[PDB]
Scaffold this motif. Structure first.
Motif, PDB file in Angstrom:
ATOM      1  N   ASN A 191       0.784  -1.231   0.000  1.00 18.19           N
ATOM      2  CA  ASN A 191       0.000   0.000   0.000  1.00 18.19           C
ATOM      3  C   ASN A 191       0.817   1.284   0.000  1.00 18.19           C
ATOM      4  O   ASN A 191       0.299   2.307  -0.460  1.00 18.19           O
ATOM      5  CB  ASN A 191      -0.945   0.021   1.205  1.00 18.19           C
ATOM      6  N   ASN A 209      -5.991  10.003   0.283  1.00 13.49           N
ATOM      7  CA  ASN A 209      -7.030   8.993   0.425  1.00 13.49           C
ATOM      8  C   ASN A 209      -8.121   9.436   1.394  1.00 13.49           C
ATOM      9  O   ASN A 209      -9.007   8.636   1.713  1.00 13.49           O
ATOM     10  CB  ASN A 209      -6.413   7.662   0.863  1.00 13.49           C
ATOM     11  N   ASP A 258      -3.749   1.886  -7.024  1.00 18.59           N
ATOM     12  CA  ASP A 258      -4.217   1.375  -5.745  1.00 18.59           C
ATOM     13  C   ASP A 258      -3.310   1.764  -4.586  1.00 18.59           C
ATOM     14  O   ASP A 258      -3.617   1.426  -3.440  1.00 18.59           O
ATOM     15  CB  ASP A 258      -4.343  -0.150  -5.799  1.00 18.59           C
ATOM     16  N   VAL A 259      -2.206   2.460  -4.855  1.00 19.98           N
ATOM     17  CA  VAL A 259      -1.196   2.744  -3.848  1.00 19.98           C
ATOM     18  C   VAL A 259      -0.826   4.221  -3.894  1.00 19.98           C
ATOM     19  O   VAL A 259      -0.977   4.894  -4.915  1.00 19.98           O
ATOM     20  CB  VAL A 259       0.058   1.875  -4.044  1.00 19.98           C
ATOM     21  N   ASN A 291       2.432  -1.433   4.424  1.00 14.64           N
ATOM     22  CA  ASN A 291       1.017  -1.104   4.530  1.00 14.64           C
ATOM     23  C   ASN A 291       0.801  -0.137   5.682  1.00 14.64           C
ATOM     24  O   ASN A 291       1.560  -0.115   6.653  1.00 14.64           O
ATOM     25  CB  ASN A 291       0.151  -2.349   4.751  1.00 14.64           C
TER      26      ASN A 291
END
Lengths: 335, 335, 335
Positions: A190, A219, A241-242, A270
């Protein structure tokens, strides 16, 4: 003398590692830090019919236990010669009062002390997540090793025939290489936080900027947790996605600044990873009498007499940063 | 004459350099300025053993710790014949009385004295961080030079070889140049303040236009710090991570208005930098007699008789605008 | 516990350099020593007209500042067992009282403190004017450098070129060499301080023996210094207008005695040469608590608790024996 309850700080300035990976803390009531005392993980359910009793569950956590934390305890004097900062819109009448000046000096010394402790608490975290190996040194300490128990495959450095620096800068797409690095991460990756010197290499690729949607707003929770460090950390954008963070915080030596990370390095992990914040006994004569044996920090103020005749304020703790799954982060040494 | 209580201004219009980097101030209680009393920077924490021992931390001042403040005492006369400006909501009926005319001309003198002093302080700050070096000159005053200690790597000159004015205005991307110039900043930059003429060439490139943001600003309270300076300060938007500000302040010389910054220049830096605002003593008999030796400003009103039988107003101060780390900014000399 | 009123040393024992060149003393008020605060010399009064405003004289000039002092604090214990050194012409009846015996041993211990600090001051002063450069160092005190700024033109070594031993000891005359050594003095020289075994060779010349004068009395007030320290100071006589004096002083190291001046040295200077005797602050909590920051010596008696449970006596100082101008002396290294 200032009372022990004079601990009015309420500043939370964890530098991007104690604030994202090492949230939970486990202060200890015993001198050394025994790893086998953490709560640990849990089995599934062990199906059982509702007529017969079931076996009681027991979780222990880790085997190698007898670690030993550092016992940092910085001091400061309260020499009333320092030119106090002119706080905005304060009257000059109060500055004449010696008691108020002494209290202001104590309050500033507390800030200086607490900014000195977090430096070690972050150097430990950086050392832990780069190699999973971290040694404590210092004069009169008998250096103590810390082996987190890393694997070998989670240190992939680009040093083969082709590196990110000596290839095409227009047609190469680093998505495949990043995914290949993140395959052996024991989870879904992540965060790909960079060291800016190593970041500039990655940024040159047009295949990056052709897909790096660096829209403002990371985010809705990361930028909320990282705005407080407007001096050290920065946020690039979302790589799909990261997310990408550029961490440039510096830890100061005796007189000189140094970088936490090697310049051309990156690390993947993450935001939900669990990181232990185990502490140890605050081995103080007074702290034992006030029932604060197990705690994070312990301020103390005293007045020495005769040879070093001064008044001292000291902060003492014991950081032994740890991780549960050290092999979940992959530290790529770029080239 | 009006007493010292005539200090009712409480206006905070410090223009973009005393509010963004030089927020903290350290007035002194001595003729010169000594950096030893300044708290300085925190050191490392230095792992030590348990209660066996403990060593005291002293925050030194380095090598140079003696500077001469720029003392200043501009004077005005309060001749009760000057035509008062038509400030709004001003009835001439309660104005014809001298008790109000003099009371308002005193305040007008206080206002423009403070404006001149603050504008000179900003000029001092800009001369400090535009090149790192600085000087003190003036008629009937001994010249004094002040050197911050700026590194030569933070004075990049665009004219040499590769400028920005001689590239294609629709294909050249200046992000790489900005990254290469901000790499040696000793900290992530977020403020890239330009010049009114210097911003045109930077914005003329098409690649910036689409990526450049105008969404009202979403960085910090910086937009609030800009809206008060609506005249000479304009906030443009986002470069992706940093904020863009075009500042076109002016100052009045003998008879000519000039800009603070050299024409085609720009600066990169951080909005969280540490900027010292040290002040000397107000070497006056009344200030020492009233225990106001350590102060930023000192108003004074009196009537001198015999040869100059006139009433005067003075605002005495002594700025020595100073920067903690000069190497946290980059001064691009565009061409 | 004797208070600070126990200051009865009453002994003036300056050894021939604190008495000839470093007469003026200036205890500072800041920890570090800034020469830009020395009053300096005074000039002739101007012939200002009677009915006219005068002009204010400024007693400042010459920065050369930023020197730090060599803090010294020798301890001693006062365990009442040692045989007291019976002072001549004292009443022995009241020796039975232990309260008087302790109060006498306190002063007998204080005398050694004062002497052992005067020796450190002499170590500071003697080689201060021998090279200009001065490294002060020891255990528990990191080395510190203090440079006066002497030119290489003021440190002629006889070994360079022609020595003096390899010459006729009956016909050669050193007058030309002496004048050449004294030309680069920036002031008239009238003292020829020698080393006894380095002065025997100088006296070995035949012409010098009868050329040297041995008339009764010094020029004006140089024999006065001899009358005090007759043990190690001798005044040979007159050499024209320059006086011949031989300093054979010694200082005690841990158990051995060493000569103050190295073997083959001779210094050319002026009795009116200005030599500072600066000092530092008394870094002690009681010093600030009683406002005795600007002092040279600071007695203290106090009682240790627990581990070395004894009563101590201590004197703290900060000698930084200093020269106003390094270029007023010539230190010839004979050969």
């Amino acid at each position: 003398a200032q009372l022990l309850a004079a601990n009015e700080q309420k500043f939370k300035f964890d530098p991007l590692f104690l604030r994202l990976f090492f949230r939970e803390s486990y202060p200890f009531t015993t001198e050394k830090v025994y790893l086998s005392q953490i709560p640990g993980l849990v089995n599934m359910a062990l199906y059982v019919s509702p007529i017969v009793s079931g076996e009681v569950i027991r979780s222990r956590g880790g085997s190698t236990s007898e670690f030993t934390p550092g016992y940092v305890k910085p001091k400061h004097e309260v020499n009333p010669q320092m030119t106090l900062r002119r706080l905005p819109d304060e009257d000059p009448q109060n500055l004449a009062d010696p008691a108020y000046r002494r209290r202001r000096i104590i309050m500033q010394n507390m800030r200086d002390e607490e900014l000195a402790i977090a430096q070690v608490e972050e150097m430990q975290a950086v050392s832990a997540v780069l190699k999973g190996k971290y040694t404590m040194t210092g004069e009169a300490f008998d250096p103590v090793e810390v082996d987190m128990g890393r694997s070998e495959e989670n240190n992939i450095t680009q040093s083969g025939g082709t590196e990110w620096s000596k290839r095409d800068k227009s047609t190469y797409d680093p998505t495949d290489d990043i995914e290949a690095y993140a395959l052996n991460a024991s989870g879904v990756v992540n965060i790909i936080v960079f060291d800016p010197k190593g970041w500039a290499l990655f940024r040159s690729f047009k295949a990056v900027k052709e897909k790096l949607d660096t829209r403002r707003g990371s985010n809705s929770e990361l930028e909320t947790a990282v705005k407080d460090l407007g001096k050290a950390v920065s946020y690039k954008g979302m790589y799909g996605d990261v997310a990408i963070v550029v961490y440039s915080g510096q830890y100061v030596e005796n007189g000189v600044k140094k970088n936490f990370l090697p310049d051309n390095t990156m690390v993947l992990g993450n935001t939900q990873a669990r990181g232990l914040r185990t502490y140890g006994c605050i081995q103080d004569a007074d702290a034992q009498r006030e029932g604060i044996n197990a705690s994070a920090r312990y301020p103390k103020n005293w007045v020495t007499t005769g040879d070093p005749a001064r008044e001292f304020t000291m902060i003492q703790s014991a950081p032994l940063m740890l991780l549960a799954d050290p092999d979940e982060f992959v530290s790529v040494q770029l080239a």
